[PDB]
Amino acid sequence: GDHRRIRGPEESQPPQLYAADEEEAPGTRDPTRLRPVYARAGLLSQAKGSAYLEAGGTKVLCAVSGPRQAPAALRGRLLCDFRRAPFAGRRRRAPPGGCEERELALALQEALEPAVRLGRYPRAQLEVSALLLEDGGSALAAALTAAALALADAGVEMYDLVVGCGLSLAPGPAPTWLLDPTRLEEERAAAGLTVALMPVLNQVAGLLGSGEGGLTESWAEAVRLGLEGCQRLYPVLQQSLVRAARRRGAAA
Amino acid sequence: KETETEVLLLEHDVPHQPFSQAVLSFLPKMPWSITEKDMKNREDLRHLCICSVDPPGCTDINDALHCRELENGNLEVGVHIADVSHFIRPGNALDQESARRGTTVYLCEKRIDMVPELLSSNLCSLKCDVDRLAFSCIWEMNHNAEILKTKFTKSVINSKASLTYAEAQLRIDSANMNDDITTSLRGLNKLAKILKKRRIEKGALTLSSPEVRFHPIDLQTKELRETNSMVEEFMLLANISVAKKIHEEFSEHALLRKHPAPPPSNYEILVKAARSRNLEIKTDTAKSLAESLDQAESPTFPYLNTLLRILATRCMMQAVYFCSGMDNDFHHYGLASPIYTHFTSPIRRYADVIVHRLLAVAIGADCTYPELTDKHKLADICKNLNFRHKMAQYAQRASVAFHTQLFFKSNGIVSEEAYILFVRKNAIVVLIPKYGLEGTVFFEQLIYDDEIPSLKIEDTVFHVFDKVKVKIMLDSSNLQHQKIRMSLVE
Amino acid sequence: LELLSDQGYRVDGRRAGELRKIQARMGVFAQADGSAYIEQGNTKALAVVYGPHEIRGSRARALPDRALVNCQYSSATFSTGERKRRPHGDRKSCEMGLQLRQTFEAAILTQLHPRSQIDIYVQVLQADGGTYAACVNAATLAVLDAGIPMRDFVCACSAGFVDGTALADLSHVEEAAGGPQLALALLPASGQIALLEMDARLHEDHLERVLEAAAQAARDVHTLLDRVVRQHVREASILLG
Amino acid sequence: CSLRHFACEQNLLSRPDGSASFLQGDTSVLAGVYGPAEVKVSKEIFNKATLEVILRPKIGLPGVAEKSRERLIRNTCEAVVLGTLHPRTSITVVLQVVSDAGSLLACCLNAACMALVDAGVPMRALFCGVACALDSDGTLVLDPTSKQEKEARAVLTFALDSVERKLLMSSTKGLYSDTELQQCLAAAQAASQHVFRFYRESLQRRYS
Amino acid sequence: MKETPLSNCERRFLLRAIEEKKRLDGRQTYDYRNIRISFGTDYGCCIVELGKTRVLGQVSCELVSPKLNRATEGILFFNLELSQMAAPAFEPGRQSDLLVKLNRLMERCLRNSKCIDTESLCVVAGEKVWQIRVDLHLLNHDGNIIDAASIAAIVALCHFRRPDVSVQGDEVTLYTPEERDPVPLSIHHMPICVSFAFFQQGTYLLVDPNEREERVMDGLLVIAMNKHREICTIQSSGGIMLLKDQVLRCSKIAGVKVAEITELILKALENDQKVRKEGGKFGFAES
Ligand SMILES: [Mg+2]
Structure with missing residues (x-):
């Protein structure tokens, strides 16, 4: 029993597991397709920088609590707190977590440390806080992109932006690499993958993957496909940042 | 002993637990001066000679008697009971914990009660020279003891004496004479004997049984005496009158008790016995039987009739309570009486309390409630009460066996x-x-x-x-x- | 099942007054300043002593008079047949830490390493009874391997009481039986006890017996340990030149 | 009286600065104060004393309700207690619930006040706490019992001041209405008068 | 915050007064302080104060699903809290060593000694059993806890009463204290600890040390005992070198001490029952 939250029931299982049906399968689509993206920077007020990204059922926030006092030893730091709202996903999980939240946090940190330049932010720790309001597919990639937007918004220095992209594998007899999929295409999947790069200097920053199976060539094709997707996505984020800067110029 | 007692009381389910706090609460606080507000519906007999008879060392004294001469040659007899109903009003937890404890067990040394010692020996009891509430049944009679006028009145009385049977007999016939008690006792023992022989002629049977009550240097046997038969006859008369009244007034819901007569396939043992000992007997009815047992005497066995009486008591069936609706027997083998209901001892029984209530509402001095007419619930509690009386008998037998x-x-x-x-x-x-x-x-x-x-x-x-x-x-x-x-x- | 056959034997096949063959070693891990290993039967303790070194995050705790002993305990999950979780942070491992700490602060002779951490660490890989004493002894061997001064071998062991007799170096079976078990750790040279834990019901007059029995068992443990240590020192010196 | 026999006792405990056992009826709370003392640079604030309250029952562990209640007490005391005198130090108020028979806050507040007094801590004005229970029929009862709180539809704990008998705190359970609030508040003011008379009697007999 | 440091003057004076066999308040070495046992209104509350050290003890019950290994006998949950009113240093989550050692010691002493009957408190073997928890709280800290904590847990667990229960098959019926009379617990023997403090490496030993004596002592020997001379636990802490005769003598002392404490406890319970059987919700006993 937790003594910092309200007294609820010991255990609670959802109703779906008590359902009786073969859930609907997506079917067919253009494998090299991308979902419609709404990215806006400057949403939140009380934060030095914030960003919001929506792609399908995916809905993610990120805020940046700026430098807070706390060479190669007087080098900045950034600690990232990924956190999925308990009302995302078919199932509910207590807020704490402790299994995948921390894994994805490590991922974000490993993908952000390269882009950000911390020599110019010594003796300081940037608190990055991501929040996943709704899970609808590629989540870690949305989180990378949103954190990048929030950083670039707060005005922390960089070398280039971070663009992510998630891929899955069709378990059909002719397995094809499915780009920017949905939670259904992702739970009915064999393998998953996530790339994240910096498109100007064309360098990966952090990737990840897993598989019911695969093979070298397949993984390589997946990688390059995700790279092309990230390239095709970059301009949206560019325009978003320009727009937010124009609104700031307008405010004063 | 302090282990065997509790063990038998757990096996026969006889509840031994003490009284819970809620119960004690519904009791009256114990500054208790007779409230002249409740005394409205009742009367005042404080100007009366009363002498409650009581066995050696008792505390739940409930009954009381008197025999007042009247100018017209007739005399007014009167029995008096502790009107517990006023204290025990329904719907409480008191009533429930008194129902479950459907009777007060009296083991060889202790007694598991149904109502606290307070309400059992300090308030309801008819203690000496203290004004106490009561129900009362009054008759007018002559020196042949045929009723002429009756009444069933609530009242408040004042016991002038709490005697013992031996003290009773000596006060009666020690040649002492006083306008207070002894004359009442004498003129009442007379009617007692008359009623007794009258009902014997009516066919009712008397019996006996081996009963030993322990102190325990050397055990002793219960001894018969006039006073016992006196009080017994008067209390039986009161019960019968009350029963007739609450029957004529209530023909659907009531508490009566019957003694289902025995199938004749049980007397055959006694018949064959007295036959091998050439004493003829007629086991066709109650009269024949009774009037025969008084003849089966023979000098060779001066201690014989008692043996046949036991051999008979081994045959009689179980006397059980019931409601006037769910059955239509209305016949009590033993006393040869058709109707009989317990009315004297509510401190010692709960059916007595229900009878007090029914009789009081018939008099008009009480208000009804649903669980008094719903034959189903009354039958259920009656079944409980019979089961409980049976448990009590078994427990007391086991205790006397242990002491032996x-x-x-x-x-x-x-x-x-x-x-x-x-x-x-x-x-x-x-x-x-x-x-x-x-x-x-x-x-x-x-x-x-x-x-x-x-x-x-x-x-x-x-x-x-x-x-x-x-x-x-x-x-x-x-x-x-x-x-x-x-x-x-x- | 049984504990003391009428003949005098146990289950494992040893009388009350004897114990199980400890098999040890000194020098397991070289990346440290002192290490040891011991198997006191099926038990398998493992000790480490990171030497008297600097305090970081000073946090105003660097005692200026003496040194700072920090001993940590751990019982692996797969130690017992019943798997458990949270081997550290529990309310029992921390008690073991306290015990080891107040023992070695007594023995380790800190007055010569002021403002310095002596970090002791203990991991129990397999547990079959006598889980505290094995750890005491492994940490002792470690300290010694680290050339850390210390008054005397702080030798520990356990005793018990069954059928009006005293057993030495209990195992898990008679430890689960619930009988009185008295664990202790003393310094043989002087005859002084550094620790005395005990947990079960028993009369008082039956105390001296188990007490002296545990003491004698610890003396035997001292003999075995010191033979090991002497072999180790001899081999090392021979190798030097 | 409209409210029930209630007593107090000062300087029970030797180790804390000031202590007070305040019981009413069968509820009994015990308060201990650690006066102006140390405070780390994180908890402190210039030109004010940091007041920290920690309340702990006698069953289970403290969760959330007790934290809310101790915030209420914290802010009430900050309202009365002077803290611009003792900046960069910490006052600490510890509360322990020896017994629970309803009217809990109405007892914790009184005990806190008496403890603060015993600790000779500069206060701007005494304060008090009462509890009024509105049953369904509207009949209110002051200083209720747990039975009366369960059998009721509203309960209202009011923390009042002594100078001008205002409303420093209000914590309500159940749902009520406006007029009922006003009338129960007036009754609370009267009860607070009685409590203040009691405080004066206790301290008179303490300084004698 | 922090505890005020100890001056060398007080330290030396104490050591000398020990050398000369003189305590401070005026008692000998083989003596406790006046311990008072006061009761509350609710069955299961006890405030025991030895001198200045006050400790509160509450006992509560619950019904819960037992643990598979023991589906017959119930459960028991100790807990001791060091309230910040006990002393300044007792901030939450800081003095954890003392909490751990005290709680383990108390658990060991009471639980593993089989002081109460975990079997008697079974209701449905496999589904629902009792659960008795005991919360001790430290209010004032002047010296000896373990003794106080133990006396409190014992007075409570002997002055506690369960809500009676009826059962038939699987049908279980609980009832309220007003409908029936709660049933007490089942104790076999009441153990209570005894604390000895060693000064100068083992030369001198004291009983029931105050706070200063705890600050200038090197070692602490706890010994649990009964009125029947049955060691339940013994523990040495402080990193100290004692011997055999010392523990033997300390045990022969604890014998008498526990006998006397036990007599007192029984008298206290007797007086409380007598009072409640006359009108009054309290009970008081004095050493
Ligand atoms: Mg009579």
Whole structure:
């Protein structure tokens, strides 16, 4: 029993597991397709920088609590707190977590440390806080992109932006690499993958993957496909940042 | 003892727990001066001679009597009961914990109660020279004891005396005379004897049974005496009158008690016994039987009639309470009376309380409620009450048996006389009057006469009403059921 | 099942007054300043002593008079047949830490390493009874391997009481039986006890017996340990030149 | 009286600065104060004393309700207690619920006040706490019992001041209405008068 | 915050007064301080104060699903809290060593000694059993806890009463204290600890040390005992070198001490029952 939250029931299982049906399968689509993206920077007020990204059922926030006092030893730091709202996903999980939240946090940190330049932010720790309001597919990639937007918004220095992209594998007899999929295409999947790069200097920053199976060539094709997707996505984020800067110029 | 008592009370389900706090609460606070607000509907008999008879060392005294002469030659007799109903009003937890405890057990040493000692010996009881509430039944009679005018009134009285049976008899006929008590007692014992012989002529039967009540240097046997028959006859008359009244007024819901007469297939043992002992008996009805037992006397066995009386009591069925609706028997074998309901002792029974309530509403001095007419609930509580009375009988028997075990342990008496009651193939039941105890003795080749109940060994023969001396050895191999054993000699 | 056959034997096949063959070693891990290993039967303790070194995050705790002993305990999950979780942070491992700490602060002779951490660490890989004493002894061997001064071998062991007799170096079976078990750790040279834990019901007059029995068992443990240590020192010196 | 026999006792405990056992009826709370003392640079604030309250029952562990209640007490005391005198130090108020028979806050507040007094801590004005229970029929009861709180539809704990008998705190359970609030508040003011008379009597007999 | 440091003057004076066998308040070495046992209104509350050290003890019950290994006998949950009113240093989550050692010691002493009957408190073997928890709280800290904590847990667990229960098959019926009379617990023997403090490496030993004596002592020997001379636990803490005769003598002391404490406890319970049987919700006993 937790003594910092309200007294609820010991255990609670959802109703779906008590359902009786073969859930609907997506079917067919253009494998090299991308979902419609709404990215806006400057949403939140009380934060030095914030960003919001929506792609399908995916809905993610990120805020940046700026430098807070706390060479190669007087080098900045950034600690990232990924956190999925308990009302995302078919199932509910207590807020704490402790299994995948921390894994994805490590991922974000490993993908952000390269882009950000911390020599110019010594003796300081940037608190990055991501929040996943709704899970609808590629989540870690949305989180990378949103954190990048929030950083670039707060005005922390960089070398280039971070663009992510998630891929899955069709378990059909002719397995094809499915780009920017949905939670259904992702739970009915064999393998998953996530790339994240910096498109100007064309360098990966952090990737990840897993598989019911695969093979070298397949993984390589997946990688390059995700790279092309990230390239095709970059301009949206560019325009978003320009727009937010124009609104700031307008405010004063 | 402090272990066996609780063990038997847990096995026979007799609830022994003490009274919960809620119960004590509904009791009256105990500054208790007679409130002249409740005294409205009632009357005032404080100007009356009353003398409650009470056995040695009692505290739940409830009954009270009086016999006041009247100018017209007639005399007014009156019985008085503790009107517990006023204290025990329904819907409470008191009533529930008194129902479950459907009767007050009186073991050889203690007594598990149904109402606290406060309400049992300080408020409801008819203590001496203290004004106490009461129900009252009054009759007018003559010196032949036929009722002429009756009444059933609530009231408040004041017991001038709480006597003992021996004190009673000596106050009666020690030649002392006083306008206060002794004259009442005498003029009342008269009517007692008249009513007694009258009902005997009516066919009602008297019996006996081996009853020993322990102190425990040496146990003692209950002794009969006039006072007991007196009070018994008067209380029975009160019960019968109350029953007739609450029946005429209520023909659907009520509490009566019946004694289902026995199928004649049980008397045959007694018949065959007295036949082998050439005393004829007519077991067709109650009268024939009773008027016969008083004749079966023979000088050779001055202690004979009592044996047949026991052999009879081994046959009578179980007397049970019930409601006037769900049944239509309305016949009490024993007293030969058609109707009979308990009314005297509510401190000692709950059906008495329900009768108090029904009678009081018939008088108009109380208000009704649903659980008084719903035959179903009344039948359920009546079944509970019968079950509980049965448990109490069993428990008291087990206790007296334990005390006999203990006494034989302390004193190893051997070779005491004994008479015989039954005669069976495997064993020979036996009776000991001294210790008031009946027992068995096995013999495990025989000759078992069943046409005439008798046993035959190559040497001797066993018939009922013979004599044998016995040695009582108690076996404690299994500390559970430390059991007596009889060995025989002559 | 049984504990003391009428003949005098146990289950494992040893009388009351004897114990199980400890098999040890000194020098397991070289990346440290002192290490040891011991198997006191099926038990398998493992000790480490990171030497008297600097305090970081000073946090105003660097005692200026003496040194700072920090001993940590751990019982692996797969130690017992019943798997458990949270081997550290529990309310029992921390008690073991306290015990080891107040023992070695007594023995380790800190007055010569002021403002310095002596970090002791203990991991129990397999547990079959006598889980505290094995750890005491492994940490002792470690300290010694680290050339850390210390008054005397702080030798520990356990005793018990069964059928009006005293057993030495209990195992898990008679430890689960619930009988009185008295664990202790003393310094043989002087005859002084550094620790005395005990947990079960028993009469008082039956105390001296188990007490002296545990003491004698610890003396035997001392003999075995010191033979090991002497072999180790001899081999090392021979190898030097 | 409209409210029930209630007593107090000062300087029970030796180790804390000031202590007070305040019981009413069968509820009994015990308060201990650690006066101006140390405070780390994180908890402190210039030109004010940091007041920290920690309340702990006698069953289970403290969860959330007790934290809310101790915030209420914290802010009430900050309202009365002077803290611009003792900046960069910490006052600490510890509360322990020896017994629970309703009217809990109405007892914790009184005990806190008496403890603060015993600790000679500069206060701007005494304060008090009462509890009024509105049953369904509207009949209110002051200083209720747990039975009366369960059998009721509203309960209202009011923390009042002594100078001008205002409303420093209000914590309500159940649902009520306006007029009922006003009338129960007036009754609370009267009860607070009685409590203040009691405080004065206790301290008179303490300084004698 | 922090505890005020100890001056060398007080330290030396104490050591000398020990050398000369003189305590401070005026008692000998083989003596406790006046311990008072006061009761509350609710069955299961006890405030025991030895001198200045006050400790509160509450006992509560619950019904819960037992643990598979023991589906017959119930459960028991100790807990001791060091309230910040006990002393300044007792901030939450800081003095954890003392909490751990005290709680383990108390658990061991009471639980593993089989002081109460975990079997008697079974209701449905496999589904629902009792659960008795005991919360001790430290209010004032002047010296000896373990003794106080133990006396409190014992007075409570002997002055506690369960809500009676009826059962038939699987049908279980609980009832309220007003409908029936709660049933007490089942104790076999009441153990209570005894604390000895060693000064100068083992030369001198004291009983029931105050706070200063705890600050200038090197070692602490706890010994649990009964009125029947049955060691339940013994523990040495402080990193100290004692011997055999010392523990033997300390045990022969604890014998008498526990006998006397036990007599007192029984008298206290007797007086409380007598009072409630006359009108009054309290009970008081004095050493
Ligand atoms: Mg009578």
